[PDB]
Amino acid sequence: TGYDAVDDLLHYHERGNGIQINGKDSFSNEQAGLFITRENQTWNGYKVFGQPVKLTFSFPDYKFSSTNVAGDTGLSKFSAEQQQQAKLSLQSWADVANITFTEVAAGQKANITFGNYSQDRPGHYDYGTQAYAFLPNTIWQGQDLGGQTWYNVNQSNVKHPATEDYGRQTFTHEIGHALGLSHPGDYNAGEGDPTYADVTYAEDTRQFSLMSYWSETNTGGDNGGHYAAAPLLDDIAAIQHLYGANLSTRTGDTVYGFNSNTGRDFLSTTSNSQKVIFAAWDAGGNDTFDFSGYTANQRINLNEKSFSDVGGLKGNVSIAAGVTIENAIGGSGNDVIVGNAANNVLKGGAGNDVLFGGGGADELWGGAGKDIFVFSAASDSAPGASDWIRDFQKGIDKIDLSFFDKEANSSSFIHFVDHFSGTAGEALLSYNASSNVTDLSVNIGGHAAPDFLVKIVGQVDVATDFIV
């Protein structure tokens, strides 16, 4: 049934509350954020949390023959392409927490610096390392190393971050360290051989945090060979814990995905081939997840902290804690679209879709195809805040009320009548041929009056259009 599909999406990636996944403990979004910042170091001071911060950054002109604090040499300044991508990574962190970044001249002392290295010793090129950075307040010989980030330019992804997404992710990851974030678990490579089996909690994967090195496939995600460019779900919790949530970000009506007005590369796409991977942070307005241009079967959940399967990928889109996204538009595939307690405009597009509005007064459009509109509570469409199904086609679309009889474990609870009598479970269809509107009223609670009312544009055939 349509309800089965909804129920499935609602319990996708449940976490915390004593759950154990992969033989590992499951941490909630909150716990993961705290664990990722377990070093307690911030630019505001040790254990000083929730305060804004203003930081400077620059691209120093390093001398090739110079040796850095780590012992690496064959140094160089960031190229134009590298600088451009580093600035995009910085902004992605500034979008979510109260952090202000300001670029200073190559000579001026800056809090965060970017530099390339190519040799582990003079005259010897290093093809084995990727990058590293120092957390704030890292003191060495009376000097703070905090804010320094270094990258192995012999790696093509580091040299070409604009075309190699792992390079862009690396910039975001190292800057994360420079801001106070650690990897989600303790494990040393090089002089150690860690694997996902060495994680502290199940959600330590690239599906939840880009501070992680473990594949998203470990938790059931699948990014189709791509890498997230910006802070993921648990990274947002981590960074906002340190510097507070940015309440000024995208406060207007924002569109994510296709036809985006975000002005962010990782939140926008112009074709079915260009895949999105992101955790959405949005501080206000009436917002829309527009995934209309994708052909794959998608699963879109508008609940906060929940995961969606978008554009042919799995668990690649999520919504941060405290964010309310209002609308969703599916693509040409057979989609499952689950709304939240707010008023939502849900559009299935072509294909056979399953739409679930949840609470609030929702506006549901099945579009072309055999669509199913699902309900599981009187509050889903309360009289006075009724849902509207705007394009119902009798004999083609369906209204799924199967939840009620299943819960009641009775085939006679929900049953259609031609007139009410106060009995619980009575359902009544009222068709107005002049206005082309059908009222579906149900007395679920067994009150004097119906406690559930859906308004439908179009005729409904009781003999063929319901799943009970």
Q: Residue 116: which of 164, 140, 144, 80 has the closest Cα? A: 80
Give residue 293's Cα distance to chain centre: 19
Point out which span in 138-146, 239-247, 306-314, 372-380 binds Ca ion (CB under 5 A): 372-380
Q: Does 254 bind Ca ion (CB under 5 A)?
A: yes
Q: Residue 147: which of 97, 118, 181 has the closest Cα? A: 181
Number of other CB atoms surrounding residue 136 within 10 Å: 24
Amino acid at site 359: G
Binding-site residue positions? 173, 177, 183, 213, 250, 252, 254, 282, 284-285, 287, 324, 326, 331, 333, 335, 340, 342, 344, 348-351, 353, 357-360, 362, 366-369, 371, 380, 387, 397
The residue among 218 and 269 lying less far from Ca ion, judged by its C-beta, is 269
CB of 35 to Ca ion, least distance (A): 29
Per-residue DSSP letter, 201? B
Strands (E), 178-281: 255-257, 278-280
Q: Residue 68: which of 28, 119, 17, 30 has the closest Cα? A: 119
CB of 381 to Ca ion, least distance (A): 5
Q: Does 351 bind Ca ion (CB under 5 A)?
A: yes
Helix (H) or strand (E) holding 438: strand 437-442
Binding-site residue positions for Zn(2+)? 173, 177, 183, 213
The residue among 293 and 348 lying less far from Ca ion, judged by its C-beta, is 348
CB of 22 to Ca ion, least distance (A): 32
The residue among 216 and 287 lying less far from Ca ion, judged by its C-beta, is 287
Q: How many residues bind Ca ion (CB under 5 A)?
A: 25
Point out which span in 34-42, 238-246, 266-274, 378-386 binds Ca ion (CB under 5 A): 378-386
Instruction: Give phi and psi for 319, each to the nearest 5.
Output: -120, 130
| Calpha distance 259→266 (Å, rounded) | 13
The residue among 181 and 427 lying less far from Ca ion, judged by its C-beta, is 427
Q: Exactly one of 174, 203, 216, 426 is catalytic; which is it?
A: 174
Q: What is the 3-state secondary structure (H, E, C) of 57-79?
A: EECCCCCCCCCCCCCCECCECCC
What residues form DSSP beta bridges with 133? 149
Contacts of 438 (CB under 8 A, 6+ apart): 392, 429, 430, 431, 432, 455, 456, 458, 459, 460
CB of 278 to Ca ion, least distance (A): 14
Q: Is 174 a catalytic residue?
A: yes
Q: Does 246 bind Ca ion (CB under 5 A)?
A: no
CB of 66 to Ca ion, least distance (A): 46
Q: Residue 154: which of 121, 116, 123, 114 has the closest Cα? A: 116
The residue among 311 and 339 lying less far from Ca ion, judged by its C-beta, is 339
Q: Does 344 bind Ca ion (CB under 5 A)?
A: yes
Pairing, β 452-457 against β 437-442: antiparallel
Give residue 310's Cα distance to chain centre: 10
Q: Does 366 bind Ca ion (CB under 5 A)?
A: yes
Given a contact cutoff of 8 angstroms between Cβ atoms, the answer to whether 353 and 346 are in contact is: no
The residue among 215 and 262 lying less far from Ca ion, judged by its C-beta, is 262
Q: Does 400 bind Ca ion (CB under 5 A)?
A: no
| Residues in contact with Ca ion, shown as a per-residue x/- string from 279 to 318 under the rule CB under 5 A | ---x--x-x-------------------------------
What's the length of the chain? 468
Q: Does 95 bind Ca ion (CB under 5 A)?
A: no
Given a contact cutoff of 8 angstroms between Cβ atoms, the answer to whether 94 and 280 are in contact is: no
Q: Does 324 bind Ca ion (CB under 5 A)?
A: yes
In the complex, the residues that contact Ca ion under the rule CB under 5 A are 250, 254, 282, 285, 287, 324, 330, 335, 339, 344, 348-349, 351, 353, 357-358, 360, 362, 366-367, 369, 371, 380, 387, 397
Which residues are designated catalytic?
174
